[PDB]
Amino acid sequence: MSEEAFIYEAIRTPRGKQKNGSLHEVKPLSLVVGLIDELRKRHPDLDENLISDVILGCVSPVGDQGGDIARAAVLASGMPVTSGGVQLNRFCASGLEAVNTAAQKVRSGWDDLVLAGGVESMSRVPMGSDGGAMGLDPATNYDVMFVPQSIGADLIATIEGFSREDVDAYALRSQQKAAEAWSGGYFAKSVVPVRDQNGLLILDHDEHMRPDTTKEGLAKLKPAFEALGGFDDVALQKYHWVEKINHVHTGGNSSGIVDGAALVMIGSAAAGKLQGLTPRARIVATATSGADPVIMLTGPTPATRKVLDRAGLTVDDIDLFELNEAFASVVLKFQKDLNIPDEKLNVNGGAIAMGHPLGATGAMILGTMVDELERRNARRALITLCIGGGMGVATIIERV
Amino acid sequence: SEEAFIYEAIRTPRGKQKNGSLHEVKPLSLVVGLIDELRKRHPDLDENLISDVILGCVSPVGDQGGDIARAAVLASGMPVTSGGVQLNRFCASGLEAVNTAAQKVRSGWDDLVLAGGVESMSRVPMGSDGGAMGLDPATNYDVMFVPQSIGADLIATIEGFSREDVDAYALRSQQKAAEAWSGGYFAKSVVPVRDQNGLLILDHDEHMRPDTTKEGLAKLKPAFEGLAALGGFDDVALQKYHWVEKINHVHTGGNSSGIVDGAALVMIGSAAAGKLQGLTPRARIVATATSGADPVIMLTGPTPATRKVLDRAGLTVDDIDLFELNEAFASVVLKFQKDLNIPDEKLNVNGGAIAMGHPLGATGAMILGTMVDELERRNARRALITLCIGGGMGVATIIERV
Amino acid sequence: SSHHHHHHSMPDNTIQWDKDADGIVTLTMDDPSGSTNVMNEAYIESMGKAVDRLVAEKDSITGVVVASAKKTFFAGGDVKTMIQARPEDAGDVFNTVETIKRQLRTLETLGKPVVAAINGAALGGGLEIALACHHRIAADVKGSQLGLPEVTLGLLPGGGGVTRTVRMFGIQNAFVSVLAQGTRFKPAKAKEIGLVDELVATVEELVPAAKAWIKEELKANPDGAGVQPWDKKGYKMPGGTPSSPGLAAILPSFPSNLRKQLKGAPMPAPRAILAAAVEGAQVDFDTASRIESRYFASLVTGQVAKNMMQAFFFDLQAINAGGSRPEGIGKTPIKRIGVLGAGMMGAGIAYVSAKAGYEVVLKDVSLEAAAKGKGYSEKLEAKALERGRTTQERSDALLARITPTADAADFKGVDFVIEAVFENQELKHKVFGEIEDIVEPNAILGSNTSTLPITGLATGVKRQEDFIGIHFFSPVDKMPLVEIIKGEKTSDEALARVFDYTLAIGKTPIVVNDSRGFFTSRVIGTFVNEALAMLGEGVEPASIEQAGSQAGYPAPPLQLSDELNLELMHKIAVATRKGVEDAGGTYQPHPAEAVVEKMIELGRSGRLKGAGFYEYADGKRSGLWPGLRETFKSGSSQPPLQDMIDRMLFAEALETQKCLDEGVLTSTADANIGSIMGIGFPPWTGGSAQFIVGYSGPAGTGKAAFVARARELAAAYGDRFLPPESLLS
Numbered sequence A: 001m002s003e004e005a006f007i008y009e010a011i012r013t014p015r016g017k018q019k020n021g022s023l024h025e026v027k028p029l030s031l032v033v034g035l036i037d038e039l040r041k042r043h044p045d046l047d048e049n050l051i052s053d054v055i056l057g058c059v060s061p062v063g064d065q066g067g068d069i070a071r072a073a074v075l076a077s078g079m080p081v082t083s084g085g086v087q088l089n090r091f092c093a094s095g096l097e098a099v100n101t102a103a104q105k106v107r108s109g110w111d112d113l114v115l116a117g118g119v120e121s122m123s124r125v126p127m128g129s130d131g132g133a134m135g136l137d138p139a140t141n142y143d144v145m146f147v148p149q150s151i152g153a154d155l156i157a158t159i160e161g162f163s164r165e166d167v168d169a170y171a172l173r174s175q176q177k178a179a180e181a182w183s184g185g186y187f188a189k190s191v192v193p194v195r196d197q198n199g200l201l202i203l204d205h206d207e208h209m210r211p212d213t214t215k216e217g218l219a220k221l222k223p224a225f226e227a228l229g230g231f232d233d234v235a236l237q238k239y240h241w242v243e244k245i246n247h248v249h250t251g252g253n254s255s256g257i258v259d260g261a262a263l264v265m266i267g268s269a270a271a272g273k274l275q276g277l278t279p280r281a282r283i284v285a286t287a288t289s290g291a292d293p294v295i296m297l298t299g300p301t302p303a304t305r306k307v308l309d310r311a312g313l314t315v316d317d318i319d320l321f322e323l324n325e326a327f328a329s330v331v332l333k334f335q336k337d338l339n340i341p342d343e344k345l346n347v348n349g350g351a352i353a354m355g356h357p358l359g360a361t362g363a364m365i366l367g368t369m370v371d372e373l374e375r376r377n378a379r380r381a382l383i384t385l386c387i388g389g390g391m392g393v394a395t396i397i398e399r400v
Numbered sequence B: 001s002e003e004a005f006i007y008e009a010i011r012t013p014r015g016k017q018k019n020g021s022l023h024e025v026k027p028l029s030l031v032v033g034l035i036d037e038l039r040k041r042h043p044d045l046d047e048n049l050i051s052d053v054i055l056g057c058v059s060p061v062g063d064q065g066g067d068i069a070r071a072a073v074l075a076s077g078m079p080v081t082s083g084g085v086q087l088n089r090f091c092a093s094g095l096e097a098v099n100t101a102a103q104k105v106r107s108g109w110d111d112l113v114l115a116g117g118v119e120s121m122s123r124v125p126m127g128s129d130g131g132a133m134g135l136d137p138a139t140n141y142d143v144m145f146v147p148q149s150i151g152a153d154l155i156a157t158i159e160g161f162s163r164e165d166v167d168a169y170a171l172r173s174q175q176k177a178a179e180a181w182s183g184g185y186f187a188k189s190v191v192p193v194r195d196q197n198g199l200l201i202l203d204h205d206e207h208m209r210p211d212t213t214k215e216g217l218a219k220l221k222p223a224f225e226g227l228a229a230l231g232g233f234d235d236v237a238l239q240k241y242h243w244v245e246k247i248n249h250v251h252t253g254g255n256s257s258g259i260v261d262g263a264a265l266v267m268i269g270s271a272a273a274g275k276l277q278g279l280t281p282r283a284r285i286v287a288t289a290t291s292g293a294d295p296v297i298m299l300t301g302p303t304p305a306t307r308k309v310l311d312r313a314g315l316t317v318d319d320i321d322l323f324e325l326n327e328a329f330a331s332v333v334l335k336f337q338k339d340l341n342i343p344d345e346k347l348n349v350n351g352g353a354i355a356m357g358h359p360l361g362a363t364g365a366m367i368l369g370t371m372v373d374e375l376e377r378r379n380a381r382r383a384l385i386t387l388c389i390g391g392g393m394g395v396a397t398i399i400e401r402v
Numbered sequence C: 001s002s003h004h005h006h007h008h009s010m011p012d013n014t015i016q017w018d019k020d021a022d023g024i025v026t027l028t029m030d031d032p033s034g035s036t037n038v039m040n041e042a043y044i045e046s047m048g049k050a051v052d053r054l055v056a057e058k059d060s061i062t063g064v065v066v067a068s069a070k071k072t073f074f075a076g077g078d079v080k081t082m083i084q085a086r087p088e089d090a091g092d093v094f095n096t097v098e099t100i101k102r103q104l105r106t107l108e109t110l111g112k113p114v115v116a117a118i119n120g121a122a123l124g125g126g127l128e129i130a131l132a133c134h135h136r137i138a139a140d141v142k143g144s145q146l147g148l149p150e151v152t153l154g155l156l157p158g159g160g161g162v163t164r165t166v167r168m169f170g171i172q173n174a175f176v177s178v179l180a181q182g183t184r185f186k187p188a189k190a191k192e193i194g195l196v197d198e199l200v201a202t203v204e205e206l207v208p209a210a211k212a213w214i215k216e217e218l219k220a221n222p223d224g225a226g227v228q229p230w231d232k233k234g235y236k237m238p239g240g241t242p243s244s245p246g247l248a249a250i251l252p253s254f255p256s257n258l259r260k261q262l263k264g265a266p267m268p269a270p271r272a273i274l275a276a277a278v279e280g281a282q283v284d285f286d287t288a289s290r291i292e293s294r295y296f297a298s299l300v301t302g303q304v305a306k307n308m309m310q311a312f313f314f315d316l317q318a319i320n321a322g323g324s325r326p327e328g329i330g331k332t333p334i335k336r337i338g339v340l341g342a343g344m345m346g347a348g349i350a351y352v353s354a355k356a357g358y359e360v361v362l363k364d365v366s367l368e369a370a371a372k373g374k375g376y377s378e379k380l381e382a383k384a385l386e387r388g389r390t391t392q393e394r395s396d397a398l399l400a401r402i403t404p405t406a407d408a409a410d411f412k413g414v415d416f417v418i419e420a421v422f423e424n425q426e427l428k429h430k431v432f433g434e435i436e437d438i439v440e441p442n443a444i445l446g447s448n449t450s451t452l453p454i455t456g457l458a459t460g461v462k463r464q465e466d467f468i469g470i471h472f473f474s475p476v477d478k479m480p481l482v483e484i485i486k487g488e489k490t491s492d493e494a495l496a497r498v499f500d501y502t503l504a505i506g507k508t509p510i511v512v513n514d515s516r517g518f519f520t521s522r523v524i525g526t527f528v529n530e531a532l533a534m535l536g537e538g539v540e541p542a543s544i545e546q547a548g549s550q551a552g553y554p555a556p557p558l559q560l561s562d563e564l565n566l567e568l569m570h571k572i573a574v575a576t577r578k579g580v581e582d583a584g585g586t587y588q589p590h591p592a593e594a595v596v597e598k599m600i601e602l603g604r605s606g607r608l609k610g611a612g613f614y615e616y617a618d619g620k621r622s623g624l625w626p627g628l629r630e631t632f633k634s635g636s637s638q639p640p641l642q643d644m645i646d647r648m649l650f651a652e653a654l655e656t657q658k659c660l661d662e663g664v665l666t667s668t669a670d671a672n673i674g675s676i677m678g679i680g681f682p683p684w685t686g687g688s689a690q691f692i693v694g695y696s697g698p699a700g701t702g703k704a705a706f707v708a709r710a711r712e713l714a715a716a717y718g719d720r721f722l723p724p725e726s727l728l729s
């Protein structure tokens, strides 16, 4: 709690789509190395020996993403051999958790300058690839009432009474704001186009975006679940008072499966000044909380409350709320629980529009908020994501 | 601002690789087992106050996939608010877990944290998870990939550690682990593994060979000539270490760390967090450091990390009562000892991984707990704990007895 | 490492050893202490000696045949021993089952072919001995069954059955086809699913066929002789191992699908089998085998296996051996059955009697009515032909056994009357009056009534000796219980005749003394009455239905309430009230009665009238009636789910004990099987009487724990939950 932690740079790749995506040919390691070389380009005289760690979120750390991808990045980019490299996994929140841990390392006083972020090539390393201590184990899968997150999202919609039209209205709005953000030039500085070994362009934009989405188009889509297991029945065994789960989530109002990476430079004031870096925002506070593991995407609500309480702030004090758009209903429920003003929420669009590359999303939506605070000349953003098993992570940042 | 304290440090016994007692046991159960032991020691602990569970795991795939830390929280019926993050910093994972927990506690934004690791190497072999440095040719060429075992032999060659020298270290590790066991040093901290019916599966470190002799160690065949000649890794190493004519292959199954199964847990918190739950602090985390050296030699990382952590704490080798460095290979320990001039009687005093085994993601937390106990037993003040890592990293931690 | 139960300083021998001139050893299992071979202490010591000897004489042995000298092959584990295992006996149970498997493992890795010669039933432990052989030949004889039914006793196949079938068929197939339900297969089916390799027509062919097979196998495949497929270098588990991508994709769904099937009921066995199956597939054979033992030991030393062994082994056995059948009485074969009434029940009763081979006259008030009653059997036969379970020739003969009529005179030659007309005494008098003089003088006069006392029905006939309650359950083609009710004047002979009829139709009998509501109706009454009370108290109907299903009932209580008519429930309550008010007493109505009356007043009295707790559209149950919530202020009472479960189970358990006290039931065996088969009391409890002695909850096990919990529920919900004196000190 000694040293203040500052954000000096926050960049990301564009997000490539799952089917015939432009990034499918690109190794997740290359995605990270590309971002390192952009930071190198932006600050050619930074003494890299002063970077003590590289912390990356990765949800499926296997195959192309195995063997501590953070250390692979350090070595592959030719960073000093003393710069560390650790892979971490806290599911959907991994990206922000890496930033949070980086900031906490700086606060402890034992690290000075850290690279944090995450990477997920979902088209090359599909969700679930890593197996899972739970699923590989019927004895504990049975005891712990595992249901996939989509089922929880549908259940949230059922309980809170969000209709199919309600969730699709949120989806349409996400697409609209992503489009507006892109045309507005809001992302020109932070989305770093991906190039090959020869300098040729592979991708410069979030290709999952469907900017011409309509109410009518969204209404035509089929529900995702009704997985073909028995998860509805399992869900209703815990939630015995609910008769029937209303399945409202589709490929149009759920986050996209995409390829992407993000990097955030975090350091103390001294670290940054010494290397001639300009701070863009300060990490005010972080929190980890959670809620029920069957309605698993309801953990952002107590996590936000905990980070607000900890920074001595109230909902009114926050200018921008950024909550990952894993599922429309999760967002709507969060907005309802906390009375979040519509115009303060996911103002530049979210993962329904641009995709949710698991381990990287936390860092992407953090950087998105750093840029937006700067652009609006506003003061405070709160960034939050739900997690599998019923966890939540949340961070407050203040523009400096 | 807040100091980080260790309140509990426990581990499983270590099951061996071939016909091992723990092979039948899921790594998840290893952790849940240790969580239940902590509950047994403090049944009135308010578990809602535990904000995170941080587990090191080097092969987080299959049984170890899917955030094993979160799985442990849920499987043990800990509060759903209690977190769960898996991390991987190779061999240092277990200690890295602890350090991160300490850093989180220091930052003020976490009160009480479970840290540790788990590696079931007999079920999830090392390398099961893939990775670019080994499996993608462009970057394998770029990082001059070489198995750590070859680095260990190269260290021996450059420093003039003979086969007899490395075997003599190996004998001492065996002797010291046997004395620690027979002495009851490990009675409180090693938690026997039991089945769903309460039947004993394992209550000791199976890999140990207390009847090791120097004669028997001399009979063993060098282990890493199968990777050296039939993989070309010797030639890769020597292209960088160009003044070295020939690598002397001195490491065997008897002077390298054992491949084993096991897990470790450590409870870390602030003074206030402990006071609230009636816990007695056992040690304070004084300082942490991560650092590194060349990735081809791979295992010289412990030295600059130890120097940095000593400097951060404003201490010298003389200020430290005990040194605990993971025994990945004998030469790495001998290199370390020579570099920093560590007195023999201060080094890995209770035996190490050559005798007891090196369950990757857990080892860092196991040898940490070992020092917490040994300080308390000897009534000594400070221990420094360190481990080498893959690709030339190092992590070090100084703890102080309370 | 030893093949024996002991290794320090006398049981009977059960294995006959014979070595051929060719070097073929025949092991003939023949326990001298019983009609069947069981996996008991004598078996274990016997096979240990034999297996030791196979090893010792290996230079002179070319092959092995495992055979039986009984009518059956081998009949499974020793239940008498297994039922007694306390938690502290886990170590011994684990050791026993590891020893059994060590012997079978040696048999299987001998380096020579072993063939099981399966003369008759090979069940559980029996089939496990066979699966340890390299080839299985089965005699295609009458009555012969093969399978692993230990899940039906709340156990698992702990002598290698899980490990081997998973090794043979993969996880999904072994679990779904063989293990999860423990179904018994005919030798022909056994061959089809791969449990058996070959069939011969007669028992005498087996041993020779086995020896011939060994001979050809040694000549044609010398390198792989006596090597199971999983013991070869290139082995590939069918469907993949858990780490294989195809299986990994569906695997997480397996426990959820199972929880769906079981509806959340606390039956540990299927879950343990699935964990054993999967965990075993992750590791080498021996490790897989040892995991299996741990899961086995876990079920055995638990309470549910105890409950289920008591009911589905001991209680069933006692019942099937004529425990409630009077002693002195001989047989009286049935020539012609007459059924009165062609509704669901009568049509159903006509079907099961016809399927059993009996001629049936099905009489209703019109030929049209009686015809549509026979149509019920035609429907069932149509399905049976489509599913391929019967031949056209066999079906046509079944249906031709049923003659529908409107004419009383057509009951000539009838020697067994089963009446199934409307629940009304004066009607039943009239209906029996129209028939008693037309039927044979010695005819049984049986009544399917759900409440009306038999003694009172009997007076409407001349020969009251032959008047009896023969109570079936809807749907008759599926429900396996017949509750036989002895009126005050019912003879012992009439009892036996109906007893024998029940067995003849493939059903299970209980004999009960005349009393209002008998056993089944009275007890099921308490169950649904608890549910309606919860609805009246303001509990979410959805929760009530969940509590019913998670308790283990085959149908949720409000749903069931619709099938039993609410007007029927009303006139039961009216009848009880009348008896008390006529005897100068004051009636204490059950809280449910007001809820029943409320629904009548609303014109929602059940499925038969198109509206109840559920909505019914075009012969289908749609969803719960959305108007229920406003009517009963649903949500205003939110008790723990376990309190709701317990209320239902406890109401029935308590009412069962009353029935036993009042002498309505005469054995706990009848109480248990009767509750399970008659009124769907959850199988995991072992029955409504076993539920008392075998209760397990947050605060203990046994009769004392049950009594404490019942007092707990009494304090919270009303005095009706206070235990009868018979349960207390």
Ligand SMILES: CC(C)(COP(=O)(O)OP(=O)(O)OC[C@H]1O[C@@H](n2cnc3c(N)ncnc32)[C@H](O)[C@@H]1OP(=O)(O)O)[C@@H](O)C(=O)NCCC(=O)NCCS
Residues within 6 Å of the ligand: A059, A091, A092, A127, A149, A210, A213, A214, A217, A218, A221, A224, A250, A251, A252, A253, A254, A255, A256, A257, A326, A356, A358, A388
């Ligand atoms: C994305 C997900 C819904 C899968 O959906 P999908 O069907 O593969 O995605 P698609 O884009 O193919 O959508 C399916 C259809 O909807 C259509 N669609 C999607 N968005 C649309 C829009 N805005 N307008 C019109 N059509 C649209 C697509 O064109 C496609 O049409 P097609 O079927 O004719 O090809 C699901 O896997 C998911 O998002 N899961 C969330 C991941 C997560 O949260 N992870 C947890 C981390 S631990």
Ligand SMILES: CC(C)(COP(=O)(O)OP(=O)(O)OC[C@H]1O[C@@H](n2cnc3c(N)ncnc32)[C@H](O)[C@@H]1OP(=O)(O)O)[C@@H](O)C(=O)NCCC(=O)NCCS
Residues within 6 Å of the ligand: B090, B091, B126, B148, B209, B212, B213, B216, B217, B220, B223, B252, B253, B254, B256, B257, B258, B259, B328, B329, B358, B360, B390
């Ligand atoms: C340990 C390692 C050499 C594997 O060796 P191994 O041969 O599988 O293990 P063993 O103990 O069986 O090998 C030693 C042989 O000599 C015997 N032996 C081992 N230790 C002995 C001792 N102290 N005295 C006498 N004999 C011994 C063993 O029985 C074996 O002989 P056998 O072939 O007759 O059975 C190697 O895989 C290793 O050490 N890896 C460690 C991984 C690591 O360093 N960390 C990775 C972090 S990225």
Ligand SMILES: CC(C)(COP(=O)(O)OP(=O)(O)OC[C@H]1O[C@@H](n2cnc3c(N)ncnc32)[C@H](O)[C@@H]1OP(=O)(O)O)[C@@H](O)C(=O)NCCC(=O)NCCS
Residues within 6 Å of the ligand: C034, C035, C036, C038, C072, C075, C076, C077, C078, C079, C080, C121, C123, C124, C125, C149, C150, C153
């Ligand atoms: C094999 C079988 C179909 C043939 O039965 P039957 O010969 O017509 O008559 P029974 O079953 O009464 O057999 C006679 C004796 O064998 C005994 N017996 C049969 N199977 C047994 C078992 N698994 N354990 C202990 N005893 C058994 C009966 O208790 C009876 O004992 P008794 O003669 O001392 O009263 C029948 O015994 C049976 O179904 N066995 C049970 C198999 C089973 O359910 N498998 C799971 C158990 S692990």
Ligand SMILES: Nc1ncnc2c1ncn2[C@@H]1O[C@H](COP(=O)(O)OP(=O)(O)O)[C@@H](O)[C@H]1O
Residues within 6 Å of the ligand: A241, C540, C543, C635, C638
């Ligand atoms: N056990 C229960 N039985 C019936 N309804 C419930 C139950 N639990 C929650 N609810 C419903 O949810 C609302 C309040 O509880 P809720 O806020 O959902 O609790 P949670 O913290 O578990 O989400 C009520 O309006 C009620 O309708």
